[PDB]
């Protein structure tokens, strides 16, 4: 019972959450919800959206 991490938001992915997308270049993406999946397909950079953890890690939010 392993818990994945969203490829866009970085949040914990418990079983049954979101969808898995496997791209043509064999790269597998796990999305926690439709918002993360939709944003990813809108070519959005997760590092530019403040609420994600990639933005928080890069910008050292919360020290």
């Amino acid at each position: 019972m392993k818990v994945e991490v969203c490829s866009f938001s970085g949040s914990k992915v418990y079983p049954g959450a979101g969808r898995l997308f496997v791209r043509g270049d064999n790269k597998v993406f796990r999305f926690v919800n439709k918002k993360s999946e939709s944003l990813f397909l809108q070519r959005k950079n997760p590092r530019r959206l403040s609420w994600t953890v990639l933005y928080r890690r890069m910008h050292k939010k919360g020290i």
Partner: protein, 384 residues
């Protein structure tokens, strides 16, 4: 020409609103006198749905020893109180209730069942009967003796402790629960001894048991034949609407046949669904209600934020696999199975690996308050 099966089942007719809400046991399991005395049914309340992960033990299956995800239904089942007994005599016109014996004291919630306005009433429901019980205690024993001599079928009168749930309704639900087991005298003796006593869910059912669930389905109001019966949508060009049946009958019989789909009531109907498997009988007194041998986190069976439109489940519960009739908080009748089960699917012991307790009020990502606090760190409100 171009055959197709008829739409819907003629076995579920008429599709009128059920004449009841509770959920009626139409047939109790066949009585075996060789077994000990036991109950055959229980009343619960639909709290909500979640999902689990468990390891499948099914040899020959591609998912054998692999993890599967399953939706489950949580039914809140606080102990019921036995308040009476009814004896039935076998007659050539069917079973007939010979007499009914009640406990000396009945709680307020069950006495509310005998009133439309309990508050405005004088609360005179069993007051003269109660005095009889404490005058000589001899008409009670005589009535019980008559059930022993006659009355091949014995059923206890049991009611729910609805005040222990978060429901706004204070009037308890009361039902006859057939007593199956050894000997009519032992049924009556068992029943008398349980007057004003609680019977809890684990004394009725057990882990991995296959049961039936009886309830009244979600109300839908009226529906046209397209959704009520599943008929094909008529073309876009159809003058005067397309959510109907094109031809509702031939010439001769010069009458609309009862087998033709018609618009009408589409919900609130009585259904008994068979073969629900008990995945867990939770205990309301232990703080690891939703913990497993693989998920040691101390958590109970209430999602974050509470069950939507229900609240917190603080009592005993059952975790049936799959779906059940009716909406959240409708009272549901759980019945012992009438069938015998020997299939591998029915007989496989069920051991849960993980129970989801994330919020069902949205795309919730934290199982517990502690997990949320750790992932996010601190917030503006948390510091001060």
């Amino acid at each position: 020409k171009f055959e197709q099966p008829r739409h819907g089942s003629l076995g579920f007719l008429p599709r009128k609103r059920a004449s009841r809400q509770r959920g009626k046991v139409k047939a109790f399991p066949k009585d075996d006198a060789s077994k000990p005395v036991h109950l055959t049914a229980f009343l619960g309340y639909k709290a909500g749905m979640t999902h689990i992960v468990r390891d499948l033990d099914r040899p020959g299956s591609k998912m054998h020893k692999r993890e599967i995800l399953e939706a489950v239904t949580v039914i809140e089942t606080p102990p019921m109180v036995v308040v009476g007994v009814v004896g039935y005599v076998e007659t050539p016109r069917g079973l007939r209730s010979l007499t009914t014996v009640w406990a000396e004291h009945l709680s307020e919630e069950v006495k509310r069942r005998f009133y439309k306005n309990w508050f405005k009433s004088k609360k005179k429901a069993f007051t003269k009967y109660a005095k009889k019980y404490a005058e000589s205690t001899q008409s009670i024993n005589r009535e019980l003796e008559r059930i022993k001599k006659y009355c091949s079928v014995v059923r206890v009168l049991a009611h729910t402790q609805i005040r222990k749930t978060p429901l706004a309704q204070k009037k308890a639900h009361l039902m006859e629960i057939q007593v199956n087991g050894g000997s009519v005298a032992d049924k009556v003796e068992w029943a008398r001894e349980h007057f004003e006593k609680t019977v809890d869910i684990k004394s009725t059912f057990e882990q991995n048991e296959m049961i039936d669930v009886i309830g009244v389905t979600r109300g839908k109001g009226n529906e046209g034949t397209t959704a009520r019966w599943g008929t094909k949508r008529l073309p876009r060009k159809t003058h005067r609407g397309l959510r109907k049946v094109a031809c509702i009958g031939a010439w001769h019989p010069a009458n609309v046949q009862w087998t033709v789909a018609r618009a009408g009531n589409a919900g609130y109907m009585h259904r008994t669904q068979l073969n629900s498997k008990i995945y867990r009988i939770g205990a309301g007194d232990d703080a690891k209600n939703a913990s497993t041998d693989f998920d040691a986190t101390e958590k109970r069976i209430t999602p974050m934020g509470g069950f939507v439109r229900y609240g917190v489940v603080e009592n005993d519960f059952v975790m049936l696999n799959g779906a059940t009739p009716g909406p959240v908080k409708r009272v549901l009748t759980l019945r012992k199975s009438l069938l015998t089960h020997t299939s591998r699917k029915a007989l496989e012991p069920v051991s849960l690996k993980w129970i989801d307790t994330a919020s069902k009020f949205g795309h919730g990502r934290f199982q517990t308050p502690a997990e949320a606090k750790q992932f996010l760190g601190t917030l503006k409100k948390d510091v001060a």
